[PDB]
Amino acid sequence: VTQRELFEFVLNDPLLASSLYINIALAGLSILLFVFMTRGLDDPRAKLIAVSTILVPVVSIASYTGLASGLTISVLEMPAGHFAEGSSVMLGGEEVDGVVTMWGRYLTWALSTPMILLALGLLAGSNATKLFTAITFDIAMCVTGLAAALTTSSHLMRWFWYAISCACFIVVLYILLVEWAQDAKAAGTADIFSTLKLLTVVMWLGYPIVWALGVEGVAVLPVGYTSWAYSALDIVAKYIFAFLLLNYLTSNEGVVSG
Amino acid sequence: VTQRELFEFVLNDPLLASSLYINIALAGLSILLFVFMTRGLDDPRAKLIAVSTILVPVVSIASYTGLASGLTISVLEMPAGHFAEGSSVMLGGEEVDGVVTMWGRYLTWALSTPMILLALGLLAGSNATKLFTAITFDIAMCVTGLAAALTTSSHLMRWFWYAISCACFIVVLYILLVEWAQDAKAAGTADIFSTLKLLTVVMWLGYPIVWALGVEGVAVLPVGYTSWAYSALDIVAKYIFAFLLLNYLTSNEGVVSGS
Amino acid sequence: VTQRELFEFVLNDPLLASSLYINIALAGLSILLFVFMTRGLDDPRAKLIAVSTILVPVVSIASYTGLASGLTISVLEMPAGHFAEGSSVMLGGEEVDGVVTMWGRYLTWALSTPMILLALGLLAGSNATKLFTAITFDIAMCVTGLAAALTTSSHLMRWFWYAISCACFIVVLYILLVEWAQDAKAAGTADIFSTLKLLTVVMWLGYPIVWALGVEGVAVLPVGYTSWAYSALDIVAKYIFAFLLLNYLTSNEGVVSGS
C-alpha cells in the first residue's frame, strides 16, 4: 500500500477525515491561544510549566498531520484468531487484506503524554524522583502499546504487550492519584490539581478501553468510530486540559513561582 | 517475509527460542522481587536509584518480547565479502536468502544501558557533567552498533560503524573505571561501587566480542549460541547486577540519602 | 531499491560521494582536534560545554556514515504538483522512478542541533526554562522537517509541515537573538556569545533555503548539489563553529566555571 492511498483513504471517508482534520485545526488554534494567554508570564518556573503545556498541542498537531497525510498509518493483517483477521480495507478501486492501523497515535503519545505529566507534576510541586518515575513508565506504556498494535504474528503476544502497558499505566495512575495529590496540598495547588487530576485519570482510562473495542482489539468499533473516540479524548485530555492549566497558571503565577 | 514467519521460526529451534522466552520470565520475576525488596525505601534520592535500577529489567522484558514475537527481527542479506553472505534461512517450507538479524537487542540497549549508568552514577555521587557524558556516549555506542547490524551495502562500512561504537564505549569504560570510582569515595559507596563496577565492565566487554563472533561478524558462532551468549550476559549485567545494587541500597539507605 | 544500489549510486557520482565522504573525515578530524584542545579543562561546567560541543561532530560522523552507506537514504516518489514528480534516478542498472531522498540528514539534526544549543545556552548563562524551550522546539523543528521530506502523499502536506517546522525555528531564533543575547551580558560572555550567536543564526537560515531550493522543495538544485550545500553548511555551522567556541572556552575556563 502507498502513503497516498492511505491519504486518499482518510479523505473519502467523512467520519475518519473529520476526526483528523478537525484536530489539526483545533490543535493549531490551541497553540496560538495558549501563546497569547501566557505572553505576560515573567516567572521562569511558571514559564517552564507553560512551555511544557504548550508542547502538548504542538506534538498533537504534528501527530494528526502524520495521520492525515498517511505518513503514520499502515495496513496490517491480524494474526490467526484475531477478531478482525481476514478483514479487508479497499484503497480506491482496489481491495487489500488487513486493517487500518493508525500507529501514528501511539507513537506520538510517547512525546505528548510525558509533557502533560511534566506540567502536572511541576504544578503539584513534585520532586525529581516522582517526575522521573511517572514520565519513564508513561513512555514505557506508550511504547509497549505501539508494539502491541504493530505485532501481527500472534493474537496472544498482542494482548500480552497490552498487559505490560497496563502495568506501566497503573504506576502513572498511582503517582497521580496518591503521590501528587499530597504534593499539591503542600504546593498550594490542590484546587486546580484535583480538577486536572480527575480529568486526566478519567480521560486517560478511555484510551485503553477504545483500543480494546476498536480494530486493534475485539473490533466492535469501526475505524472511523475508534478514531473519533480518540480525537474526542484528545480534545479534553489535551486541549481543554491545557486551557484550564494555563488559565489557572496566568492567574496564579505567584503561587507556582515557589 | 512476514512477522508471522519469524515468530514461529524462533520455534522449531529450541536453542534460539529458549534464550528468548527464558529471559522474558526471568526479567518479569526480577521485577517482582525488586519491587518488594525496595518497599522500605523512603529517601527520595535512594528512591531514584531504585526506580532507575528497576527500569533495566522493565526494558528487558519488552526487548525479549519484541524479539520473541518477531517484531524486532529481520532477515537481511549480508554484503559481498561478508562471511555470512550467501546464506539462507527458510522460514518454513520455503527458503530465502539472508540471515536472521535480531536488531531488537541493539535498539533496546540504548534504553536499558543508560539506566544502568544512571543508577551507578547516582551511587558514586557523580556530578551532572559526568552523568551527561556517560549517558550520551553510551547511547551513541548502542545506536551505531544498531546501524552496523543494519548496513547491508558494504562489508567495510559495517566494521567502520563497529569501530565508532567502540570509541564511544571507551568513554563509558573510562568514567566507570577512573571517574566514578573516585567519586564513590566522597559518596561513601566505594565498597559497593567497586563491586558493581567490576561486574559491569567485565560483562559489557563481552557484548562486542559476541557480536564479532556471531553471524553479524565473522559468523563462527550460530545465532542460537550468540543469542544465548547475550541472553547469558543480560542475566548478569542486568538482573543479578540490579539485585546487588538494590540489596545494598535497602540495607544502606542512609548512605545515599542526601535528601 | 536495495541499500547496495544506493551505496553504489553515491559512488560513481563524484559530487554526491565527495559531499559525504569528505565530512566523514572532517568530522573525525574535528573530534580528535577538539579532544586535544580541551584536555586541560577541569571545571565541571566548563567541561559540560566542551562535551556538549564535541558531541556535535560525533553525531555528524555517524550521520554521514549513515548517508554514505545508503542506510539512511531512500528513493521516494513525489506527489502530483511537485516540481520533481515523475522523476527518474537510474539506480543500479535500471531506471527507477522517484527522487533520492537523503532523510538521514534531517534525522540526525534532531540529535546534533540540540547540542549546539545546549553549548550556546550554557555559554550565555541561560536558566533551565529557556534551555528546555530552545531544545524542545529545536527537536520539533528537526522532526517535522524529516516528516516533510518523508511525506509523498500530498504536495500541500509537505509545505504545511515545512510551515510547522518554520514556526518551531522562530522560537529557537527568538531565544538566540533576544533571550540569550541579554543573558550573556550578565554571564560575562557577551563578546563571544554575540559572535557565535550570529554565525549560528546566519548558517541555520541556510538550511530551509537549501531545502526549498533542492529536490525536496522546488528542485532547482539536483540531489548532488543539494547535498554539497548541506555539507558546506555543516562545515561552518558545526565544525568551525565548534572550533571557535572551544578556542574561547579553553582560554576562559574561569569565566564560565561557575557551577
Ligand SMILES: CC(/C=C/C=C(C)/C=C/C=C(C)/C=C/[C@H](CCC(C)(C)O)C(C)(C)O)=C\C=C\C=C(C)\C=C\C=C(C)\C=C\C=C(C)\C=C\[C@H](CCC(C)(C)O)C(C)(C)O
Ligand atoms: C489553525 C491551523 C490549521 C488549521 C487547519 C484547517 C482549518 C484545516 C482544514 C481542512 C479541511 C476543511 C479539509 C477538508 C477535506 C478536503 C477539502 C478540499 C477543498 C481539498 O476538497 C474533506 C472535505 C474533509 O474531504 C494551524 C496552526 C498552526 C500553528 C503553529 C504551527 C503554531 C506554532 C507556534 C509556536 C511553536 C509558538 C511557540 C511559542 C512559545 C514556545 C512561547 C514562549 C513563551 C516563553 C518563552 C521563553 C521562556 C523561551 O522566554 C510563553 C510565555 C510560554 O508564551
Ligand SMILES: CC(/C=C/C=C(C)/C=C/C=C(C)/C=C/[C@H](CCC(C)(C)O)C(C)(C)O)=C\C=C\C=C(C)\C=C\C=C(C)\C=C\C=C(C)\C=C\[C@H](CCC(C)(C)O)C(C)(C)O
Ligand atoms: C511476571 C511477568 C511475566 C511472566 C512470564 C512468564 C512466566 C512467561 C512464560 C512463557 C512460557 C512458559 C512460554 C513458552 C513457549 C510457548 C509459546 C506459545 C506462543 C506457543 O504460547 C514454548 C513452549 C517455549 O515454545 C511479568 C511482569 C511484568 C511487569 C511489568 C511490566 C511491571 C511494571 C511495573 C513496575 C516495574 C512497577 C514499578 C514501581 C515503582 C518504580 C514504584 C515506586 C517506589 C517509589 C515511589 C515513588 C517514586 C512513586 O514516590 C519504589 C520504592 C522505587 O518501589
Ligand SMILES: CC(/C=C/C=C(C)/C=C/C=C(C)/C=C/[C@H](CCC(C)(C)O)C(C)(C)O)=C\C=C\C=C(C)\C=C\C=C(C)\C=C\C=C(C)\C=C\[C@H](CCC(C)(C)O)C(C)(C)O
Ligand atoms: C580521522 C577519521 C576518519 C578519516 C576518514 C577518511 C580520511 C576517509 C576517506 C575516504 C575516502 C578517500 C573514500 C574514497 C571513495 C573510494 C576510494 C577507493 C580507493 C577505495 O576506491 C570515493 C573515491 C569517494 O568513491 C576518523 C576519526 C574518528 C574518531 C572517532 C570515532 C573518535 C572518537 C573519540 C571520542 C568519542 C572521544 C571522546 C572523549 C571525551 C568525551 C573526553 C572527555 C574530556 C572530559 C572528561 C569527563 C567529563 C569524562 O570527566 C574532554 C575535556 C571534553 O575532552
Ligand SMILES: *C/C=C(C)/C=C/C=C(C)/C=C/C1=C(C)CCCC1(C)C
Ligand atoms: C494525548 C494523548 C493521550 C492523553 C494518550 C493517552 C494514552 C493512554 C493512557 C494509553 C494507554 C494504553 C494502555 C494502558 C494499554 C495498551 C494500549 C494503550 C496504549 C491504548
Ligand SMILES: *C/C=C(C)/C=C/C=C(C)/C=C/C1=C(C)CCCC1(C)C
Ligand atoms: C542490557 C544490555 C547491556 C548491558 C548491553 C551492553 C552492550 C554493549 C556494551 C555493546 C557494545 C558494542 C560495541 C562496543 C561495538 C559494536 C557492537 C556492539 C553494539 C555489540
Ligand SMILES: *C/C=C(C)/C=C/C=C(C)/C=C/C1=C(C)CCCC1(C)C
Ligand atoms: C548540524 C545541522 C544544522 C545546524 C541544521 C540546521 C537545520 C535547520 C535550521 C533546519 C530548518 C528547517 C526548517 C525551519 C523548515 C523545514 C525544513 C528544515 C528542516 C530544513
Ligand SMILES: [Cl-]
Ligand atoms: Cl525564563
Ligand SMILES: [Cl-]
Ligand atoms: Cl499526541
Ligand SMILES: [Cl-]
Ligand atoms: Cl520520592
Ligand SMILES: [Cl-]
Ligand atoms: Cl535490553
Ligand SMILES: [Cl-]
Ligand atoms: Cl566534571
Ligand SMILES: [Cl-]
Ligand atoms: Cl547531524
